[PDB]
């Protein structure tokens, strides 16, 4: 066909293309925070305890839990980006809005 | 710092922490409710088909 | 497509597009009582400071 | 969905109730530590405001 | 007393914060619906 | 006075050692409970800032 007016997908597909670049740093942030939580659990177990068996078990348990939670924290970050791609809302704080 | 050790040091820990009869009734009822719910959801699953 | 109904609203497209502009109306019918706010704020501040 | 919601609400507790044995020192001591931590948190809440 | 000024400050700050929360709910609620119900039905149809 | 001051910093702890036995389940149990409570309080203190 012929270009009478500017199409919407010229906007929507460039935005959707640039938004997909955001997945990476968002998962970097989650990895860094899990690093800090493991560090602090090690400080607490180092300071308090001198029953080697009890400090070993307690740090294993608290870190296994933090690992099982990384698997749930990263789904909602993927699902928030997917939600960002599902619809284009031009009703606020934009040139048109 | 000191309350937990004082409470623990008293004798007959099996009688210090005894439950009231109300909790025994509450947990028996919740177990029956849980099993009944599972059976009902099984029947619904086997009826929808 | 090229078959456009020029008599009605398109149905799902613009009924839903307007459900997304009725929803903002639902968000402003809240009617929070100011007096109980200012009371509970006062008690909150005093209880937070405490002793 | 109704039955699923009810099971979800009840499961976290019946998980413990289904394993009950009256002669269980581990339960008694866990209850003791839970009551003591609750008391010390409520007390600090009322006095310090924390 | 001065406590009233403190109440006034908190009263204004909550309004300002809730002014931000509504925007987020207004932006995310339609998209949450597009992804999980409308676009899923469309793709199922095709 | 100097000796009495020194002995005060030692009595609080050696009162546990004087009755030490190689096989004492009650001592172990209360050491476990006290160390779990210490851990939970310290961790919350380190991240919350309370």
Question: Residue E7's CB: how many other CB atoms inside 10 A?
Answer: 17
Q: How far is CA A97 from CA A93, E41, F39, F48, in A?
A: 6, 29, 53, 40
- B33 and D10 Cβ atoms separated by less than 8 Å: yes
Residue E9's alpha-carbon distances to C37, D9, E2, E14, F38, in angstroms, are 12, 40, 11, 9, 39
Nearest to C41 by CA among F26, E13, A35: E13
Pair C43, E10: CB distance under 8 Å? no
> Which residues of chain F lie closer than 8 angstroms to B8, CB-CB?
26, 29-30, 33
Residues A67 and A73: their CA atoms lie apart, in Å, by 10
The verdict on a CB contact (< 8 Å) between D33 and F29 is no
**Nearest Cα residue to A59 out of F50, F43, F30, D36:** F43
What sign results for the dihedral spanned by CA atoms B9, B10, B14, B16?
A: negative
| Nearest-CA distance B5 → chain F (Å) | 7
CA distance F42 to chain A (A): 7
CB atoms within 10 A of CB E31: 19
Cα dist from F48 to A20, C45, D46, F35, F40, whole Å: 34, 20, 19, 20, 12
CB A42 within 8 A of CB F39: no
Numbered residues of chain E with Cβ closer than 8 Å to any chain A Cβ: 23, 26-28, 30-32, 34-35, 39
* Chain B residues touching residue F30 (CB < 8 angstroms): 4-5, 8-9
A89 touches chain E (CB under 8 A): yes
Among candidates D14, D3, D18, which has minimal Cα distance to B37? D3
Subunits that touch chain E (at least 3 Cβ pairs < 8 angstroms)?
A, C
Tell me how far apart the alpha carbons of residues A22 and A16 are, in angstroms, rounded to a whole number: 11
Cα E11 to Cα C41: distance, rounded to the nearest angstrom: 8
Task: Give the closest of D3, D13, D39 to B30, CB-based.
Answer: D13
Q: List the determination method.
A: cryo-EM
Quick one: closest CA in A to E35, which residue?
Answer: A86
Q: Which residues of D touch F37 (CB under 8 A)?
A: 33, 36-37
- On whether the CB atoms of residues B9 and F24 are closer than 8 A, the answer is no
User: Which of E28, E30, E35 is nearest residue A82 as measured by Cβ atoms?
Assistant: E35
Q: If we measure between CA atoms, which residue out of E10, F48, D43, F46 comes closest to residue C51? A: D43
Tokens of F9: 């910093």
F32, F42, F47 ranked by CB distance to A48: nearest: F42
What are the E-state strand segments in D1-50?
A: none
Residues from chain F contacting residue A43 (CB–CB below 8 Å): 46
Residue A83 CA, distance from chain mean position: 13
Tokens for A46? 């180092």
Count CB-CB contacts under 10 A for residue A48: 19
Do residue E34 and residue A89 have CB atoms under 8 angstroms apart? no
| C42 → chain E, closest CA residue | E7
Q: Is A12 on the interface with E (CB under 8 A)?
A: no
Q: What is the resolution of this structure in A?
A: 3.3
Separation of alpha carbons B4 and E37, rounded Å: 54
**Chain-chain contact of D10 with B40 (C-beta, under 8 angstroms):** no
CB atoms within 10 A of CB A45: 21
| Residues in chain E closer than 8 A to C23 (CB atoms) | 26, 29-30
d(Cα F17, Cα F14) in Å, to the nearest integer?
Answer: 5
Instruction: Indicate yes or no: CB of A40 within 8 angstroms of CB of F43.
Output: yes
Backbone discontinuities in chain B, residue before each (C to N > 2.5 A): none
Total length of chain A: 97
Helices within A1-97 (DSSP H only): 9-19, 23-48, 52-73, 75-86
Give the contacts of B28 (CB within 8 A, at least 6 positions apart): none
């Amino acid at each position: 066909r012929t270009g009478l007016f500017t199409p919407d997908m010229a906007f929507e597909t460039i935005v959707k293309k640039q938004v997909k670049k955001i997945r990476e740093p968002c998962l970097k942030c989650v990895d860094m925070v899990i690093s800090e939580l493991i560090s602090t659990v090690r400080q607490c177990t180092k300071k308090l305890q001198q029953y080697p068996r009890l400090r070993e078990e307690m740090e294993r348990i608290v870190t296994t839990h933090i690992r099982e939670r990384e698997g749930r924290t990263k789904e909602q970050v993927m699902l928030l980006i997917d939600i960002e791609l599902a619809y284009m809302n031009t009703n606020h704080e934009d040139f048109i809005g | 710092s000191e309350l937990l050790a004082n409470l623990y040091s008293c004798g007959d820990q099996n009688t210090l922490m005894e439950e009231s009869a109300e909790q025994a009734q509450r947990r028996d009822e919740m177990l029956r409710m849980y099993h009944a719910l599972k059976e009902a959801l099984s029947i619904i699953g086997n009826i929808n088909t | 497509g090229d078959q456009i109904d020029t008599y009605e609203l398109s149905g799902g497209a613009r009924i839903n597009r307007i459900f997304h502009e009725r929803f903002p109306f639902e968000l402003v019918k809240m009617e929070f009582d100011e007096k109980e706010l200012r009371r509970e704020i006062s008690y909150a501040i005093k209880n937070i400071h405490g002793i | 969905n109704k039955l699923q919601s009810q099971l979800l609400s009840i499961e976290k507790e019946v998980e413990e109730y289904k394993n009950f044995r009256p002669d269980d020192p581990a339960r008694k001591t866990k209850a003791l530590l839970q009551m003591v931590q609750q008391f010390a948190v409520d007390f600090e809440k009322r006095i310090e405001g924390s | 007393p001065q406590l009233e000024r403190q109440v006034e400050t908190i009263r204004n700050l909550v309004d300002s914060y809730m002014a931000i929360v509504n925007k987020t709910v207004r932006d995310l609620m339609p998209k949450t619906i597009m992804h999980l119900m409308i676009n899923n039905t469309k793709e199922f149809i095709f």
